[PDB]
């Protein structure tokens, strides 16, 4: 419990959006693949 919890909720959800952003960077690796390619 905490007076405010949301202040940590936020956190939460910010550590989803850092894997997001590392998913987003592999296919940053194929799309340069997908675009000499084309």
Same mark, same amino acid.
């Given at each position: 419990? %905490? &007076?405010?919890?949301?202040? &940590? %909720? #936020? %956190?939460? #959800?910010?550590?989803?959006?850092?894997? /997001? /952003?590392?998913?987003?960077?592999?296919?940053? /690796?194929?799309? +340069?693949?997908?675009? /000499?390619? +084309?």
């Amino acid at each position: 419990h %905490s &007076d405010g919890i949301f202040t &940590d %909720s #936020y %956190s939460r #959800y910010r550590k989803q959006m850092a894997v /997001k /952003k590392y998913l987003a960077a592999v296919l940053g /690796k194929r799309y +340069k693949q997908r675009v /000499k390619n +084309k």
